[PDB]
Amino acid sequence: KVFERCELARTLKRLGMDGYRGISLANWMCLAKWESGYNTRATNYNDRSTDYGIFQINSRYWCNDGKTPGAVNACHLSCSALLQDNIADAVACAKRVVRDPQGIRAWVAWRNRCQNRDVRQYVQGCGV
Ligand code: NA
């Protein structure tokens, strides 16, 4: 599913993402745009791991895709649950990811496209 901007924004607010571990909704939104373009089916293949879904969660430490060497499955979820039109499991696993010391900097794209920039644009006009 390819979410529209405010639609995705309303779902994340409802799922408790706003201000979670100090990460504003606008930042979660900025991360999702750059990582997947709001598409839940987004998949990126690297040599030894695959990134899944809307937040591009990695198969090495987070989900089990049954084909990754050294998999820890910290989210205790199959990676296929991160390619669902329903994003409740992805939000839940993304919350776990930022509980780690790196926080949202775990994603290089956030650092390069969102960090220290005006991200108000992602939620303006959404009533969120
Ligand atoms: Na894993």
Q: What Rg value do the Cα atoms of the chain yield, rounded?
A: 14
Task: Tell me the C-alpha distance between 48 and 110, whole Å.
Answer: 22
Selected catalytic residue, list 18, 35, 100, 118: 35
Where do the DSSP E strands lie in the chain? Answer: 43-45, 50-52, 57-58
The CATH number given to whatever domain includes residue 47 is 1.10.530.10
> Does residue 51 have an active-site annotation?
yes
**Which residues, in sequence order, are CB contacts of 13 under 8 Å at separation 6+?**
25, 128
Instruction: With CA atoms as reference, report the closest residue to 65 among 52, 84, 46, 47.
Output: 52
Is 113:119 a contact under the CB 8 Å cutoff? Answer: no
Determination approach: X-ray
Selected catalytic residue, list 47, 51, 89, 100: 51
Boundaries of domain holding 19: 1-128
Task: Tell me the C-alpha distance between 91 and 66, whole Å.
Answer: 21
How far does residue 21's CA lie from ligand 1's centre (Å)? Answer: 22
Strands 43-45 and 50-52: antiparallel
Strand partners, 50: 45
| Residue corresponding to tokens 């979670």 | 20
Strand partners, 23: 20
How far does residue 116's CA lie from ligand 1's centre (Å)? Answer: 30
**What DSSP character marks residue 52?**
E
How far does residue 31's CA lie from ligand 1's centre (Å)? Answer: 21
Task: Tell me the C-alpha distance between 120 and 128, whole Å.
Answer: 11
How many domains are contained in the chain?
Answer: 1
